[PDB]
Amino acid sequence: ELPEVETVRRELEKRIVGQKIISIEATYPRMVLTGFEQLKKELTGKTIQGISRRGKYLIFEIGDDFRLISHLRMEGKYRLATLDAPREKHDHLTMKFADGQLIYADVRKFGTWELISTDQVLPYFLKKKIGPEPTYEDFDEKLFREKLRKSTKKIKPYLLEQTLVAGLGNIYVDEVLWLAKIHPEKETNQLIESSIHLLHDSIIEILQKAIKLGGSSILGSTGKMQNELQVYGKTGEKCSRCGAEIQKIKVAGRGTHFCPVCQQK
DNA sequence: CTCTTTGTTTCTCG
DNA sequence: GCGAGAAACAAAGA
Ligand SMILES: [Zn+2]
């Protein structure tokens, strides 16, 4: 989710910025949605200038004019390896540098790469309808409140859409709703102003805490946020606030962990 | 064997 | 448009 992608972004920023790409190889070229041979031709010999993030998307800034947009989906994992590192089964792509290589692996093959130009990045995210970053500066509670008032959607699935605010997935949506004492099936037009305020702040605070702790490990695999989870994967354990048993249900196809006392239906 | 579960996004169907 | 269900894929457990 956003905190894990941010953790990877920071680690990569530290290590590969300034590196010339010597070569690029694929064993699974079909995950390059803009075309693998095209990407190899355009990026070979270019230097990595920066790594940015928007929501759950990583953005490699490569030369002045290219942006490689990468989504890790369910299982994508990057690692920095020596040039002689052996192949592992689900490795799909590598960018080779002079002194090491960046390898992308993805057991389920869901993750994507798209090569687009610098001036097309903002239109790309507008087209995806990605909502604001989860910061006090960008995530305006007033617009959030108005969108929730207008909808009969259930809060968990509406938060997962990425349109009200970017970066929540199954772990942090469950954690946030427990923190804000809101049931995941609550229709959003039933939420009162004070609950919306607590939700807004809890989204920002949980994701910032998860970033600080290097994400949850259930690059970026040394996180400590998993030790702070209150409900996700905690079925049958007791709520830290009230002592009721955490329950698990299915909401719009997703596993959903909540306290039935603290999160009233 | 069959079913279910899983850090996601985006489709069809009615 | 909406919600339900499932595709894309792989692995593991009941
Ligand atoms: Zn509780």
Q: How far is the CA of A109 from the C1' of B2 (A)?
A: 24
C-alpha–C-alpha distance, residues A92 and A104, integer Å: 6
H or E segment and range at residue A258: strand A254-258
Residues 83-142 of chain A in contact with strand C via CB under 7 angstroms: 89-90, 107-110
C-alpha–C-alpha distance, residues A148 and A26, integer Å: 44
C-alpha–C-alpha distance, residues A111 and A28, integer Å: 11
Sorted by sequence, the CB contacts under 8 Å of residue A144 that are 6+ apart come out as: A164, A165, A196, A200
CB A209 within 8 A of CB A192: no
A71 touches strand C (CB under 7 A): no
CA distances from A40 to A50, A78, A110, A246 (A): 19, 18, 20, 49
* Resolution in angstrom units: 1.8
C-alpha–C-alpha distance, residues A203 and A180, integer Å: 9
H or E segment and range at residue A81: strand A77-81
A250 touches strand C (CB under 7 A): no
Residue environment code for A29-61, b if the CB has 16+ CB neighbours within 10 A, otherwise e: eebbeeebeebbebbeeebbeebebbbbbbbbb
A186 touches strand C (CB under 7 A): no
Q: How far is the CA of A172 from the C1' of B5 (A)?
A: 19
Which method resolved this structure?
A: X-ray
Of A6, A105, A243, residue with least CA distance to A260: A243
C-alpha–C-alpha distance, residues A6 and A33, integer Å: 23
Among all chains, which residue has been given the structure tokens 């540098």? A97
Output phi, psi for A12, to 5 deg.
Answer: -65, -40
- Neighbouring-strand partners of residue A78: A104
Q: How far is the CA of A80 from the C1' of B10 (A)?
A: 31
C-alpha–C-alpha distance, residues A9 and A22, integer Å: 21
- Neighbouring-strand partners of residue A102: A80, A95
Give the strand order in the sheet containing A101-105: A23-26, A91-96, A101-105, A77-81
- For A212, other C-beta atoms within 10 Å of its C-beta total 12
Which pairs count as long-range contacts for A135-144, CB under 8 Å and 24+ apart, including other chains?
A: A135/A204, A136/A204, A139/A165, A139/A200, A139/A203, A139/A204, A141/A196, A141/A197, A141/A200, A144/A196, A144/A200
Residue environment code for A108-147, b if the CB has 16+ CB neighbours within 10 A, otherwise e: eeebbbbbeeeeebeebbeeeebbbbbeeeebeeeebbeb
Q: Which nucleotide is nearest to A109 (CA to C1')?
A: C9
H or E segment and range at residue A249: strand A247-251
Amino acid residing at A173: V
What does R_g of chain A's alpha carbons equal in angstroms?
Answer: 20
C-alpha–C-alpha distance, residues A163 and A128, integer Å: 9
C-alpha–C-alpha distance, residues A127 and A183, integer Å: 31
C-alpha–C-alpha distance, residues A51 and A122, integer Å: 15
Is A92 flagged in the annotation as binding?
no
Q: Which residues surround ligand 1, an ion (CB under 5 A)?
A: A 239, 241-242, 244, 259, 261-262
C-alpha–C-alpha distance, residues A46 and A23, integer Å: 10
Would you state the structure tokens that stand for residue A253, as one six-digit string? 């196809």
Of A195, A159, A184, A202, residue with least CA distance to A257: A184
Sorted by sequence, the CB contacts under 8 Å of residue A22 that are 6+ apart come out as: A44, A45, A96, A97, A98
Sorted by sequence, the CB contacts under 8 Å of residue A135 that are 6+ apart come out as: A204
- All structural domains of chain A, each given as residue ranges with its CATH number in brackets, are 1-131 (3.20.190.10), 132-265 (1.10.8.50)
Sort residue A220 into left (φ over 0), alpha (ψ -120 to 50) or beta.
Answer: left
Q: Which residues of A are catalytic?
A: 1, 56, 254
Would you state the structure tokens that stand for residue A41, as one six-digit string? 């031709």
Q: How far is the CA of A83 from the C1' of C13 (A)?
A: 37
Sorted by sequence, the CB contacts under 8 Å of residue A147 that are 6+ apart come out as: A163, A164, A188
CB A135 within 8 A of CB A204: yes
Say how many CA atoms lie within 13 Å of A51 toward its Cβ: 19
C-alpha–C-alpha distance, residues A226 and A193, integer Å: 30
A152 touches strand C (CB under 7 A): yes
C-alpha–C-alpha distance, residues A124 and A142, integer Å: 25
At A157 the three-state DSSP class reads: helix
